[PDB]
Amino acid sequence: FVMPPVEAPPPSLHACHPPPWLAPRQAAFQEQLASELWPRARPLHRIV
């Protein structure tokens, strides 16, 4: 039953003119990791 008092998304790094390849690379990495690992995290659904 224990819930954290506060819940926040991770801090985000913002630059006016970032390298245009960093964000797509991170997005692709996250997409692949989620597609490979989210099905494996389903048993922990009730705890979360």
């Binding site: 690992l37 494996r40 995290a41 922990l44």
Partner: protein, 445 residues
Amino acid sequence: TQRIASHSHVKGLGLDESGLAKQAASGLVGQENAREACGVIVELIKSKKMAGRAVLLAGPPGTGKTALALAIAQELGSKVPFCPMVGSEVYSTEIKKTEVLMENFRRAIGLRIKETKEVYEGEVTELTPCETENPMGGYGKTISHVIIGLKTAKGTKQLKLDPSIFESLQKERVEAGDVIYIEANSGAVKRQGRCDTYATEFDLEAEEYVPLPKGDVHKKKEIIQDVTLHDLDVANARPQGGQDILSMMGQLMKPKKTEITDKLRGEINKVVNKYIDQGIAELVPGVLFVDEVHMLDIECFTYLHRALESSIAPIVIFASNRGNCVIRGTEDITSPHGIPLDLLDRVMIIRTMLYTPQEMKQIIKIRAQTEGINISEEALNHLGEIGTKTTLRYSVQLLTPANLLAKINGKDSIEKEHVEEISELFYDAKSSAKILADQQDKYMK
């Protein structure tokens, strides 16, 4: 196994059927009283009705303490677990000292599991449903069995199985000419490939084609598996084989020993008791041998009181060559074997004495026999005289250099001259200490 170690000649305790110790038997010479006491301890271990009993082997260095413990292990056999351990091993960078000690305690308690695995092997020749002349419900076809024909090298048998296996057969994609095995204890069909007789030299599959099974279609055997309580504890604390994210994390992350909880150990104990009551398993309480116990600190010694008082603990054998030394972890507290007096009250002390020159000569001869070395009588007497001074370990360590020197000289036996030359080439502790004292200015620190 082929290499000769320091205790390669110890094949057990040379005890008569009445427990009296023979002067020289099973590779052991002398130490008759200690050997008799160790035989009594062996009977205690075999009785399997005592827990947490501790024995301390006390005596000067090179008096057979480790040799006696290894003789006990030889007497027990490979069936009985024997977990050797030095006191320095409790100092780990991953787990606490008490956890190391508890894990070593659980390693000594063994469990022997006996089960019968009954399987049906064969190449599927026939796959025929057994329809019923009166279909239930009036329409369609109803089946009451599925006949599976299994063919092996020396037979062929037909099995009238439950209709429910039709789903397993389809899931495994079992067809005629495939090699499958069915387990009686589970009622499941497993397809172990296709028969190799239907494979051509132009095929490229690797794990698809399997040889036709030899032997009978119905194979049953008794499986004896030996496990320890620590094996079950570790396999349950960091499980391997799951497909969830936690198992993936375990595979990814570096393995690390963890502090296994009393909850998991109690669950393992309950499962072990259930297996014992069912007749599946037989408990095999063994021995934990802790050499150089004096290297344990005061925390380890204190924990050993509770560890030994337990009803699940094995029989622990300690060994210490220290005198009135200072207990580690304490400031200027001296105890007779480096062991606090509280733990000495919980142990039975076996005393090992020094060796007479005759016993030293016998041990040297035995070691020469073990190392495949022929030594003359005069060389043996000179080496025994060398062993009267210096030590016994020094004399037994001159055998292989002297044998090599003889072989270089072109002789098949060690003569006295070879031992003299080796004694000149290599120094013992006392001679080196004399040199160091005579030249203490030229040495460092």
